[PDB]
Amino acid sequence: HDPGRGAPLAKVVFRDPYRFKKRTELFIAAEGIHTGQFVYCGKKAQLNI
Amino acid sequence: KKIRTSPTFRRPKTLRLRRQPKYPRKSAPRRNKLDHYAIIKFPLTTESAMKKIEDNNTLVFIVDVKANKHQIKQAVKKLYDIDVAKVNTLIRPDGEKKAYVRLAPDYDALDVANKIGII
């Protein structure tokens, strides 16, 4: 929960495909998003919430 | 053929030489103004100091404000040919530094106090 913002945020952890490290981003959570869920991003990503 | 592994260009480390002056900035080094005689001003002969010397087996001196406890210990050792257990210092509400010099059990504070002249 972000103070001053009604919409909740979601922390998503990726892996950088250049260095051995785990990147973390703070997206805006959409309806139906739950913890322990795989979310994809890219041109070939499927059409899911 | 040296490949740029990273996309960042940082400043290379160049050789830096150590200073080798042609002449010294000043002709001679400054003589120390905190010698073993300047640090110790005079022993304290107050009634409280007298009782401290007689009972706690310590010595009370008036010391320069710039002196450290190691300097006080070494100065007392060099001056009075004594070995010090510990030194407790304080700043009096007049600008002078007061130090309690605890003497080792081998030596007696009363004897050295008689030798230096205070009693």
Binding site: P17, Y18 | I3, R4, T8, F9
Partner: protein, 241 residues
């Protein structure tokens, strides 16, 4: 056997979502310091912009085979350097009254270095061959000079590198070099060199004046416009013909 069965292969799939990418060459994607980017972008601009023929003339430089012969001739007439002027002066001083030394003897022919000196002896029709560097940092130093050489009938050539031209003299750089006079041994070689030089610069100066140079787009834009032109041709390339 010489092969241990424990020796496996373990290949790496360098794809998307697989193990991390290898440390490839990234010279194209380096955030270079501002001066490197500036010195590359000024060359890019010189390629893009319509360079006037006065500056574009120095892009036409003498070829390697003629340049090496020119340097071979120039090395013979190098000016006196340090440690040699003093030796000559001492030789003349010790011979002041030793062998009846009047010292009128001779000054051997030498090269000419400065722009001022070369221009002065070109306006007087004293020079026979003039060599001009192409990479002077202010181009304004040598713009008029090819036109002046053509007007005065003095053959001129453009040589690669001001440092290379200035290595003939004993300094870092030199703008131009002029052959005021050469020894009788090398007069035929000089004549051949000036004959080869003046058939590329002096007699074609009108073309050089009319020859603008530039307006060359980058390979990305050129490739894009070529793709568009090929598509436009394909619109009517097999349907009609």
């Amino acid at each position: 056997k010489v092969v241990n069965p424990l020796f496996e292969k373990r290949p790496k799939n360098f794809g998307i979502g697989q193990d991390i990418q290898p440390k490839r060459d990234l010279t194209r994607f380096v955030k270079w310091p501002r001066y490197i980017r500036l010195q590359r972008q000024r060359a890019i601009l010189y390629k893009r912009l319509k360079v006037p023929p006065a500056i574009n003339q120095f892009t036409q430089v003498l070829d390697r085979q003629t340049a090496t012969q020119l340097l071979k001739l120039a090395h013979k007439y190098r000016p006196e350097t340090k440690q040699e002027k003093k030796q000559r002066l001492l030789a003349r001083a010790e011979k002041k009254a030793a062998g009846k030394g009047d010292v009128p003897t001779k000054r051997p022919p030498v090269l000419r270095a400065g722009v001022n000196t070369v221009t002065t002896l070109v306006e007087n029709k004293k020079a026979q061959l003039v060599v001009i560097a192409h990479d002077v940092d202010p181009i304004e130093l040598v713009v008029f000079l090819p036109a002046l050489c053509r007007k005065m009938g003095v053959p001129y050539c453009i040589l690669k590198g001001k440092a290379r031209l200035c290595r003939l003299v004993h300094r870092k750089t030199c703008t131009t070099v002029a052959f005021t006079q050469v020894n009788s041994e090398d007069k035929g070689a000089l004549a051949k060199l000036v004959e080869a030089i003046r058939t590329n610069y002096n007699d074609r100066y009108d073309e050089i004046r009319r020859h603008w140079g530039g307006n060359v787009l980058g390979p990305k834009s050129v490739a894009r416009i070529a793709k568009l032109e090929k598509a436009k041709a394909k619109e009517l390339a097999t349907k009609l013909g």
